[PDB]
Amino acid sequence: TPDCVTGKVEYTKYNDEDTFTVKVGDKELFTNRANLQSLLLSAQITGMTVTIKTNACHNGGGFSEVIFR
Amino acid sequence: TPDCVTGKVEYTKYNDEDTFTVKVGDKELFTNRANLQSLLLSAQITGMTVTIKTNACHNGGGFSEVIFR
Amino acid sequence: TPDCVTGKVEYTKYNDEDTFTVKVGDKELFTNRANLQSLLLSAQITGMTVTIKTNACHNGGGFSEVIFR
Amino acid sequence: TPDCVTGKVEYTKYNDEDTFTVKVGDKELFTNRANLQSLLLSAQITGMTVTIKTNACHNGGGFSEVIFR
Amino acid sequence: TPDCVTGKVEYTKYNDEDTFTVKVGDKELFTNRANLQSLLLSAQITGMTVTIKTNACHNGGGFSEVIFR
Ligand SMILES: OC[C@H]1O[C@H](O[C@@H]2[C@H](O)[C@@H](O)[C@H](O[C@H]3[C@H](O)[C@@H](O)[C@H](O)O[C@@H]3CO)O[C@@H]2CO)[C@H](O)[C@@H](O)[C@H]1O
Ligand SMILES: OC[C@H]1O[C@H](O[C@@H]2[C@H](O)[C@@H](O)[C@H](O[C@H]3[C@H](O)[C@@H](O)[C@H](O)O[C@@H]3CO)O[C@@H]2CO)[C@H](O)[C@@H](O)[C@H]1O
Ligand SMILES: OC[C@H]1O[C@H](O[C@@H]2[C@H](O)[C@@H](O)[C@H](O[C@H]3[C@H](O)[C@@H](O)[C@H](O)O[C@@H]3CO)O[C@@H]2CO)[C@H](O)[C@@H](O)[C@H]1O
Ligand SMILES: OC[C@H]1O[C@H](O[C@@H]2[C@H](O)[C@@H](O)[C@H](O[C@H]3[C@H](O)[C@@H](O)[C@H](O)O[C@@H]3CO)O[C@@H]2CO)[C@H](O)[C@@H](O)[C@H]1O
Ligand SMILES: OC[C@H]1O[C@H](O[C@@H]2[C@H](O)[C@@H](O)[C@H](O[C@H]3[C@H](O)[C@@H](O)[C@H](O)O[C@@H]3CO)O[C@@H]2CO)[C@H](O)[C@@H](O)[C@H]1O
Of D46, B20, D9, nearest to C33 by C-alpha is B20
**Cβ contacts of residue B12 below 8 Å, gap of 6+?**
B20, B21, B22, B23, B40, B41, B44, C67, C68
Q: How many CB atoms lie within 10 A of CB B69?
A: 15
Residue A7 Ramachandran class (φ > 0 left, ψ -120 to 50 alpha, else beta): left
Alpha helices in A1-69 (DSSP H): 36-46
Cβ atoms within 10 Å of A5's Cβ, excluding its own: 20
Residue to probe by mutation, ligand 4, list D21, D30, D31, D55, most atoms within 8 Å of CB: D55
Q: Which domain holds residue A14?
A: 1-69
* Nearest-angstrom CA–CA distance, A21 and A31: 6
Residue B1 CA, ligand 2 centroid: distance in Å: 10
Closest CA to A43 of A66, A25, A65, A61: A66
Parallel, antiparallel or unpaired: strands A49-53 and E20-24: unpaired
Q: In Å, how far are B37, B56, C62, E35 from C65, measured between CA atoms? A: 13, 23, 10, 27
Burial of C15 per CB tally in 10 Å (0-12, 13-18, 19+): middle
CATH number at residue B32: 2.40.50.70
Measured distance CA(A69)–CA(C56) in Å, rounded: 48
Local structure of B50: helix, strand or coil: strand
Chain E residue set in contact with A, beta carbons under 8 Å: 10-16, 18, 34, 37-38, 41-42, 44-45
Of D32, D34, D65, the C-alpha closest to D50 is D65
Q: Which atom of ligand 5 is nearest to the CA of E30?
A: 1
Phi and psi torsions of E45, nearest 5°: -65, -45
Q: Angle formed by the axes of helices D36-46 and C36-46, to 10°?
A: 10
- Which subunits have 3 or more CB–CB pairs within 8 Å of chain D? C, E
Whether residue A51 contacts residue A5, with contact meaning beta carbons closer than 8 Å, is answered with: yes
Smallest CA-to-CA distance from B31 within C35, D55, A50 is with C35
How many folded domains does chain E comprise?
1
In 3D, which of C44, C50, C46 has the Cα closest to residue C68? Answer: C50
- E32-A4-B46 Cα angle (round to 5): 70
* Minimum distance, in Å, between the CA of residue D44 and any CA atom of chain E: 9
Region class of A65: left (phi > 0), else alpha (psi between -120 and 50), else beta: beta
The CB density around residue C66, as the number of other CB atoms within 10 Å, is: 23
First to last CA, chain E: 18
**Parallel/antiparallel/unpaired status of strands D27-31 and D61-62:** parallel
